Design a protein around this nucleic acid. Structure first.
Ligand SMILES: Nc1ncnc2c1ncn2[C@H]1C[C@H](O)[C@@H](COP(=O)(O)OP(=O)(O)OP(=O)(O)O)O1
Ligand SMILES: [Mg+2]
Ligand SMILES: [Mg+2]
Length: 539
DNA sequence: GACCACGGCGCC
DNA sequence: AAATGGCGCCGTGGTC
C-alpha cells in the first residue's frame, strides 16, 4: 500500500495498538487507517482521533470506548469480527479470524488497518446470499456495538468505603473458620489448597471419597462432594463456610474497590460481543455479570452497586425467558397455555421441593427451583436430581417423567432440531443465528450426547440473547431522549440509571420496550424494580 | 514478571 | 460427582 499523509478519507478502515486490552485503561500507542490502496499513519494518535467520523475496523467498539473516555463521539461502524462471528461463532478472536479469512493479526497499526480493509472485503462476500445473518448484522450486532461502547464508557458507581469496611469484618470471620478447621485437622495446612485439603479429608481423616476430578483423577473436594459429607465430620461444614467467604472476598470484596477509574470514579466492564457459542454477551475485566445474589454476604456485596446522587437504578428482568422461548420454538400448546394463563413454573417446583404452598415460597427456594427446571430441561440425569433434591432415583425419575409428559411437543422440537443439526452441521435461533455442532455424528455416545445437549440448548439460549440484544438496540435511543443511561446487561436483565424525577417514566417505558421487542405465541413478561442500589432495585 | 492447566465456583 | 447449557475469575502448583 502507498503511504499517504494523515488524515484518511471518509469510510477508511482503522487499525490501532493499545498498551493493554481494556480500552478504559489503555494508552493509545498507535492509530492508522486504510482505504483505496493507501495507508495513513497518525503522527500523534490522540490528536488524530479527532479526525475520524466513525471507528470502522477490527475491534471497532474498543477504539470507540477509548474515544468516549477522551470526550469524543466516535461511534463504532463495520467490524469484520462481527461478520466472522455471525458466519461462525467460533470466530471469537482477531488472530483466528485473520488466519481464516486472509491475513495476519500483527502488533502494528498500519497492518491492522490493512488487515481490517481486506478482511471486511472477504467476509462481506461470504455474507452475501446469507440474508438472515445480514439482517442480524444490520439490525442487531452493528448497532448494538454502539450501545455497548456507551455502556462501557459510562460505568457503574460502587460504594468503595462500604466494601473496604466489609473486608475487615469478613477477614475476621475467615480467621475464626480456618482456626476451627486446623483445630479439627489436628494441624495447620493451606486451606486454599484443594490438594492439601484432599489429603486431610481422605487420608488423615477417614472420610470416604465421593468422586474424582476430570483431567487428573484426584478425589474431588467440591461443594457437591462436601455437602454429601456434611454429617460425616464437623470439619466439613466449616470448610463450606470458609469457601463461601474466601470466594466472595477474593473475587469481589477485595478487587473491585481498586478498579475505580480515576477520571470517572466508576467501575467499567467490557461487554464482549463475539465471545460465546450461542450469541450471548460476556462481561470481563471486571466480570459484572456474576455479582453475588444468593447468600446473605453475597447480597451485602450487591448493595455496593449504587445510583449516582439524585439518580436511581432501574432493574428489568425477563420472567422465565427461556421457557417462553421454548413454547414459541416448539408450539407446545400446554406450555403456551401456561404463559397465557399467567402461571409461574419456578414457584410451582419450589412448592413441590420444599413442601410448602406458593404463598410461602421465598427467594432462595425459587432460586433452587430454577436449577431444577433448567437442569431437567437441558438434560440432567435422574441420578443427579435425586442428589440435589435429596430424594430416591424412583422419585427423581418420576419428576422427569411428568415434566416432559406435561409438554408433549418439546421432545418433538428437540428431535427435529437434532436431526436438522446432523444434516446441515448447524442449529439456529429464531432469527437464524447459527452454531456449528459437528460432533452430533460422533461414534462415542458420551461425546455425541454432550454435543446433542449443546445443540438443542443453543436455539433456546441464543433466541433469548437475540431478543435481549434487539431490546437493547431499540431502548438505547429512547433512554438518551429521557436523559437516562443503560448501565449493565446480565443476559436477560438490564440495569439502567435514571434521574430520580424520571425513574418511574423510564421504568414504564423500558418495560414496554422489552415486553414488545418481538411478539411471540406467548407474552414476554418483565419484572421491574427501582432503588438506590442493585439489591433494592429487585427487592 | 508472564503464562498455563486445573479444580472450583460466582452468575444467567 | 453426577446425561443440564452458557460464561470469567480465583488460588494453587508449576513452567519459563
Ligand atoms: N441453572 C441454569 N441452567 C441453565 N440455564 C440457566 C440456569 N439459570 C439460568 N439459566 C438461563 C435460563 C433462564 O431463562 C435465563 C435467565 O435467568 P433468570 O432470570 O435467573 O431465570 P428466569 O428468567 O427463567 O426466571 P425469573 O422469572 O426469576 O427471571 O438464563
Ligand atoms: Mg429472568
Ligand atoms: Mg435474570
Amino acid at each position: 500500500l502507498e503511504e499517504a499523509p494523515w488524515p484518511p478519507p471518509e469510510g477508511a478502515f482503522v487499525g490501532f495498538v493499545l498498551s493493554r486490552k481494556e480500552p478504559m485503561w489503555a494508552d493509545l500507542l498507535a492509530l492508522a487507517a486504510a482505504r483505496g490502496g493507501r495507508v495513513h499513519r497518525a503522527p500523534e494518535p490522540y490528536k488524530a482521533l479527532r479526525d475520524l467520523k466513525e471507528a470502522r475496523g477490527l475491534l471497532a467498539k474498543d477504539l470507540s470506548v477509548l474515544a468516549l473516555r477522551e470526550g469524543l463521539g466516535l461511534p463504532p461502524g463495520d467490524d469484520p469480527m462481527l461478520l466472522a462471528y455471525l458466519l461462525d461463532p467460533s470466530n471469537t478472536t482477531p488472530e483466528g479470524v485473520a488466519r481464516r479469512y486472509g491475513g495476519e493479526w500483527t502488533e502494528e497499526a498500519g497492518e491492522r488497518a490493512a488487515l481490517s480493509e481486506r478482511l471486511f472485503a472477504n467476509l462481506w462476500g461470504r455474507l452475501e446470499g446469507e440474508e438472515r445473518l445480514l439482517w442480524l448484522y444490520r439490525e442487531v450486532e452493528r448497532p448494538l456495538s454502539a450501545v455497548l461502547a456507551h455502556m462501557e464508557a459510562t460505568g457503574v458507581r460502587l460504594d468503595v468505603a462500604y466494601l473496604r469496611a466489609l473486608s475487615l469484618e469478613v477477614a475476621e470471620e475467615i480467621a475464626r473458620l480456618e482456626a476451627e478447621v486446623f483445630r479439627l485437622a489436628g494441624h495447620p495446612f493451606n486451606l486454599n489448597s484443594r490438594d492439601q485439603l484432599e489429603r486431610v479429608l481422605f487420608d488423615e481423616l477417614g472420610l470416604p471419597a465421593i468422586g474424582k476430578t476430570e483431567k487428573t483423577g484426584k478425589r474431588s473436594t467440591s461443594a457437591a462432594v462436601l455437602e454429601a459429607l456434611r454429617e460425616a465430620h464437623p470439619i466439613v461444614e466449616k470448610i463450606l463456610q470458609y469457601r463461601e467467604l474466601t470466594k466472595l472476598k477474593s473475587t469481589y470484596i477485595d478487587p473491585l474497590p481498586d478498579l475505580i477509574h480515576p477520571r470517572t470514579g466508576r467501575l467499567h466492564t467490557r461487554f464482549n460481543q463475539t465471545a460465546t457459542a450461542t450469541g450471548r454477551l460476556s462481561s470481563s475485566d471486571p466480570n459484572l455479570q456474576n455479582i453475588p445474589v444468593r447468600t446473605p454476604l453475597g447480597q451485602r456485596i450487591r448493595r455496593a452497586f449504587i445510583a449516582e446522587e439524585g439518580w436511581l437504578l432501574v432493574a428489568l428482568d425477563y420472567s422465565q425467558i427461556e421457557l417462553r422461548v421454548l413454547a414459541h420454538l416448539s408450539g407446545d400448546e400446554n406450555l403456551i397455555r401456561v404463559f397465557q394463563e399467567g402461571r409461574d413454573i419456578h414457584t410451582e417446583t419450589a412448592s413441590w421441593m420444599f413442601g410448602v404452598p406458593r404463598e410461602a415460597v421465598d427467594p432462595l427456594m425459587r432460586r433452587a427451583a430454577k436449577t431444577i427446571n433448567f437442569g431437567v430441561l437441558y438434560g440432567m440425569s435422574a441420578h443427579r436430581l435425586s442428589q440435589e433434591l435429596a430424594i430416591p432415583y424412583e422419585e427423581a425419575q418420576a419428576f422427569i417423567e411428568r415434566y416432559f409428559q406435561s409438554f408433549p411437543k418439546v421432545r418433538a422440537w428437540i428431535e427435529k432440531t437434532l436431526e436438522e443439526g446432523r444434516r446441515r452441521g448447524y442449529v439456529e435461533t429464531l432469527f437464524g443465528r447459527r452454531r456449528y455442532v459437528p460432533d452430533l455424528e460422533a461414534r462415542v455416545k458420551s461425546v455425541r450426547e454432550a454435543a446433542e445437549r449443546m445443540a438443542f440448548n443453543m436455539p433456546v439460549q441464543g433466541t433469548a440473547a437475540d431478543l435481549m440484544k434487539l431490546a437493547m438496540v431499540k431502548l438505547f435511543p429512547r433512554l438518551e431522549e429521557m436523559g437516562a443511561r443503560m448501565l449493565l446487561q446480565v443476559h436477560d436483565e438490564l440495569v439502567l440509571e435514571a434521574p430520580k424525577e424520571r425513574a418511574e417514566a423510564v421504568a414504564r417505558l423500558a418495560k414496554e420496550v422489552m415486553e414488545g421487542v418481538y411478539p411471540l405465541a406467548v407474552p414476554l413478561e418483565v419484572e421491574v424494580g427501582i432503588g438506590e442500589d442493585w439489591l433494592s432495585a429487585k427487592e
